[PDB]
Symmetry: D3
Subunit: 291 residues, 6 copies
């Protein structure tokens, strides 16, 4: 049965990920380990959060998410293990993933285990949670953990025990909500008739530009598909296009497309060409949209 | 038991491949998903084709190849699913892969699913095909596909249904041969006694240079192992060596080797040193060979 | 539930690794193939050695390590397959990986198969071995091996037979110890009271700097945690810090940490910042430490 | 007090320019040699033309302009020496450089000597000429000219004779107008109401962007200072600002200024910040402007 | 007689400097124009200041310094022309430049003309001044100055009139001290027994590192030649060497030298090797020195 | 009348060259200072030598060459001043430079002043010398020279005294031939019928490749214009062309030209395209030529 989906900042150029995987198979012989990605900017908890927030709906119920960037490795800190509530960001207008009308996922069906450093901020915000525990029991972590490798000791190892059916509530004491570290999410400001945000990510390998201006932020301004937009990046680049569902709607190869990405965020790209790379556009640059 | 071998342009820096994998495991619980590669130049159909053309003889019979670069994502286009004819000859490369005399593969034993954009051109050229269908049935694709993610909606998802035993002929209507998009492959030309082609790829991470001039094109010119060759690249950057089976035949480390790569194409390298990188050699550069 | 742990210099940008995996599943249908890494500097046998030496204690007993950089591909050379003795770097007390007191591994529980080019030098040094054989039998390698792809022919293929239960002693004749190629490891020398070694690796993606100076070399010079050290790199760039167990011990983000890495070697880093990248520090640079 | 103003593509990293200067002082002992620049893109005759076209009005009457990029060096080609007619780009009213109302320059007061390769195209277009001669006399060029250094042999040397008072008409035979090589200057075209030109130069070291769109092209489309413009570069990157006389008119540091450069062409910049460098803007990129 | 020494941010890749020089020769036919440098970081008034502060002692009395970075070009601002008082930074213990005991320079013997933007801050601080005037008279600037080229209109042109003997006090009205724009010079902090400053410049082309910690700051701490220093750059690099007069005092090529540069500022270098380049050290990095 | 031609490693990015010039004009009021170049690789005596060896025949008789890279600055070393013998033959290059039959220069007509570090090795080799003196007299150098600026103190300053007519023999004691430091010049070797040398320089800004294989070395091998040559660079990167007088003889733009440069050395280029830059060719690479 069991699946662990594994996301880290460990990279793919040495044996760090393999050591974690070896231990997952040692503990839970029948496990399937699925890599999410291992390439996140080291120590960038906000970036790590983006790669793990929308996973549950895509995976079978009972999947465990081992998600780790651990700059506090070797300190007295301990990981948090949480059972999430709802698999969607939606649920009302479902938008389940899969063929047909998609695969509906039951509530309380996924566990995340992570450093208690805010990595799970958006997971908890979008999904809610039913229970959360500090990971302390020597049944699921080493008695003598390697100081420089808590991703392995405090995330990979216990994730496999959880996958093998170790009761969640036995990993350690319950954590009160305020004991779960969170980062602040800069809010999209409803300025004038415009919405002012940032570039949240460059979408590699395509060089598409993703903003933190969500479809729900747009709905709030009556902005829908077909609306002629001005999207200004870095303060000085007033891109102009209608909001369209996809890249090819821009027509000629290389033409600008303003669109909603697969997370429902306002994005901008060229049609089958890279927008970000030629002009060295970067995450953190300002993004303003108006109709 | 069932395997899906997965090749895309999605990269390995975010959760895109993982969303596809989650759904593959959801649809076909027993499946093994094997990554081919996810690093191809985005939208480069010809490059993608080289990563998938010679896979079948390496894989167990019944393997499904989910192969996708999807620049027409979100348009009315639909994927093609094809059952190939021969696993080897035309893509023999000796003949069968494996220990002893190799593993003979029965005809009609492999399915590819891909955008209908020419990605399968060389697969069909080298292997032939027995049947081909448009992928349209809501039993195997979403009713509301994400406009910007047809790699997931129109390839990953239906590949998993096929792996799970969904009948190939039920995915949609049969496609006539002319309805399968193909790209043109530039021909190897004869100019005097010399064969003129191009650098087809730089072989990373080694910096070996691979041309589109084939063993069969050399055999047609009376050229075999031992022949003293002059291989000019970029019109001006020439090289001279005998055609040898392997790198070490060049003698000293760094010496030039002209050889046949594992696909039987005329190639050039330095012995345990990078040829392409120090001189910034690139794909698309002209390549002329003469005896 | 057989496992093959697979380390190569083949990269992950083409189908080379996938060809190997396909053949592994062909030969041993119930196998799990775990990637160690495929990104090592091509032909660098010393670097490859570092990624494979400490794997056994993390993996279930019976795991086969297919480990290959093969610059002598297509020559009369043949691979070596060895069953190692001790899984840990320790004798009694062991230092075992996993939850609780870790998971002890029985002696003789792991097989490595590799080119006979010195890649296994440190594996043999740290673990010892019980038996070693030349890999020559056409039951486990191709009768007509592709000259430029011995990593596939002479490592991937036979590793899958071994995973499948093919008897190790039947792959070919026993090799005497002197017939197993070794590289020499450069000694940490003494310059008065200063220890003199090299930078053995830049620890990507973090930019931590690992030296070949071991805890044991430090102890003989009178150094444990808390000792004020001067660490000079490249005979130019000086750093000073106490030896601490981990990064956050340095205090402020960006502060210098001098520590022992997860393999017990003297290393240097910035706390949650890259040391190596801004100063363009590289492997092979001299490293001198003194109390 | 003769002056030679000297512009070449010879660079300033070796002794090439110094060899030319030595010979200038040898031939015309009282000369002052003024460097224009020596950094032009080698062999780019259009670029060289831009650095020399507006020089005469700044210089004392009788100045000789030695201007040379000479890719046809060592061929049977010979230089052209011309006495220009009008010093300014203007007729009556002139637009003279200097303090007060500027310094008027008499007609026929300046000589250019250059390869006959089109380098003087715009000088002749903007200034007209009174007389033109092929440079062939052994009184003013070497009898045995260095084949790879015609910039020295056929430009520097004869320019110094001319500065010294050698009669222009004696350097060789008169050239008819059709015998003076010209390049064609690409026309600013019309796309509806938008003007369409190119980026003619990146203005180093500031990263300002100069277009080939002239004030006169703008006037015919109904545009003077204060006009709100949309300027699109490279068919991708859009900017919007009023046309202003100078950089600081943009307000804040970093703000976009669209202005007319000191040669009267439509240009774009950031105020006391580089525009071109962060976005990697280059010469030859399309430039479209509309009111 | 007259000399103009010319320093600007105009670069040496186009005709901007030449246009200024042409006009200088037009106005003052007997002038010698000496380039200081034209390569300063555009708009960086503090950097420009460093290239012009120590010039007077090296030049004949009566020399005019035309010094210009003019980001306020085209505004209502006007240049300042000042007669400096003392040619030295010293005078007491002379340290005149030249052979023998050097060339003593009379007081009031040099004029600077510059934008009134703080470029002359250090000139006025180190030398004092006797008179200062706003440059407004149409006898010495154009009646219709080119908006984008005040370096030419408001500095080069009037500098030549001044060189030709135009009375300084006739350029325009006297400026009161408070009307002369100045920048703040971050002070070297006498912390503990240490002195905390910054890297003021990387000394190209050598890659030596210059600090703003002056010889007089060192004298204040009893630091002289022979003192064993710890110089920490960027917070984390405790360089250690005695203060020595020159590079070769460090011994072996590549060894660290801590020294006083030719302006009397604490500097650090390698002996006949670049310190700054290999480790990408930069201006603005912190610099702390202690004995 | 008097000229100083000035070559250094001081660069053109700060006021170092200008301080030298100021003093030259102070000491010798009538002087003209001609820049050779200031861009040489710092401390590279062999490179500096190439920029100064062939200057004399270009300059008026009585010219002083102030040539300095001074890594031993601030040591007890003292400069050497030498009067050379022959201006040309041995450095003829045809013979005399200039119009007609060129300008014959009398023997003993040029003085070089330089660090005694081998910078003048090839000057003395090609021109011979009549007298040489150590530069020690306080009449021509400072009594208290700046330790880090001997380029100024021990070259610039005394060069100006020499230009001003200070007797050469009064600068200090005569130096015996053995007291003049020389560097070793690697010899062009014969290997079979082929001549083996090195790339002596990349000819910036063109990317031409210059070797140390001379016209005389070719003339000794029976090689003249028209000879079909094979020129291999970096041991592996070979090229084939006839020896031609100039670039355009190669025909099409971009075609390979093998030719003799203006110093008579075997060189290779592309016709009006850069050879060195696209392929990252560098000085010090091996160069072998055969007919
Ligand atoms: N230099 C570092 N500073 C802080 N944390 C680091 C550093 N290098 C690696 N790490 C963290 O170690 C964890 C291993 F468990 C990884 O997740 C890194 O974030
Ligand atoms: N900017 C883009 N233009 C056209 N297609 C794109 C672009 N960015 C991503 N894609 C395609 O989306 C598919 C997801 F399924 C990927 O295969 C990309 O080819
Ligand atoms: N250019 C090369 N020289 C020597 N060995 C090479 C070269 N390119 C690839 N290889 C080796 O081929 C093996 C394939 F099995 C890889 O492991 C490479 O080390
Ligand atoms: N983009 C610019 N913003 C502000 N000033 C600039 C810009 N580009 C050039 N300049 C200034 O123009 C002056 C010419 F007189 C130069 O000194 C530049 O500083
Ligand atoms: N870091 C340096 N080591 C040795 N010599 C140097 C260094 N930096 C500059 N110089 C020499 O100082 C001379 C000034 F006259 C220059 O010619 C440099 O060669
Ligand atoms: N490789 C070259 N091809 C054509 N012309 C060249 C090349 N290298 C230098 N030159 C020209 O030589 C002239 C010397 F007078 C320079 O102006 C270059 O344009």
């Amino acid at each position: 049965r069991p699946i662990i989906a594994f996301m880290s900042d460990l990279g793919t150029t040495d044996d760090s990920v393999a050591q974690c995987k070896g231990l997952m198979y040692s503990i839970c012989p029948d496990v399937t380990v699925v890599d999410v990605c291992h390439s996140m900017t080291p120590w960038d908890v906000e970036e790590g959060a983006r790669y793990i927030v929308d996973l549950p709906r895509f995976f079978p119920e009972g999947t465990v998410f081992a998600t780790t960037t651990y700059p506090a490795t070797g300190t007295t800190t301990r990981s948090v293990a949480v059972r999430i509530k709802q698999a969607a960001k939606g649920g009302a207008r479902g938008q389940w993933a899969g063929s047909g009308a998609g695969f509906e996922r039951a509530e309380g069906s996924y566990i995340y285990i992570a450093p208690n450093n805010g990595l799970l901020t958006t997971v908890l915000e979008e999904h809610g949670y039913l229970e959360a525990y500090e990971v302390t029991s020597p049944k699921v972590i080493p008695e003598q953990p390697e100081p420089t490798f808590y991703g392995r000791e405090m995330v990979a190892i216990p994730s496999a025990h959880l996958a093998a059916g170790f009761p969640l509530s036995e990993v350690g004491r319950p954590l009160e909500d305020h004991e779960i570290v969170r980062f602040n999410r800069p809010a999209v400001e409803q300025d004038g008739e415009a919405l002012v945000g940032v570039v949240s990510a460059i979408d590699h390998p395509f060089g598409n530009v993703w903003t933190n201006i969500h479809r729900t932020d747009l709905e709030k301004a009556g902005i829908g598909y077909g609306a002629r937009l001005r999207l200004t990046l870095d303060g000085v680049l007033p891109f102009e296009a209608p909001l369209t569902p996809t890249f090819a709607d821009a027509g000629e190869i290389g033409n600008i497309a303003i669109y909603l990405n697969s997370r429902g965020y306002l994005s901008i790209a060229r049609n089958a060409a890279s927008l970000a790379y030629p002009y060295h556009l970067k995450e953190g640059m300002s993004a303003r949209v108006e109709a």
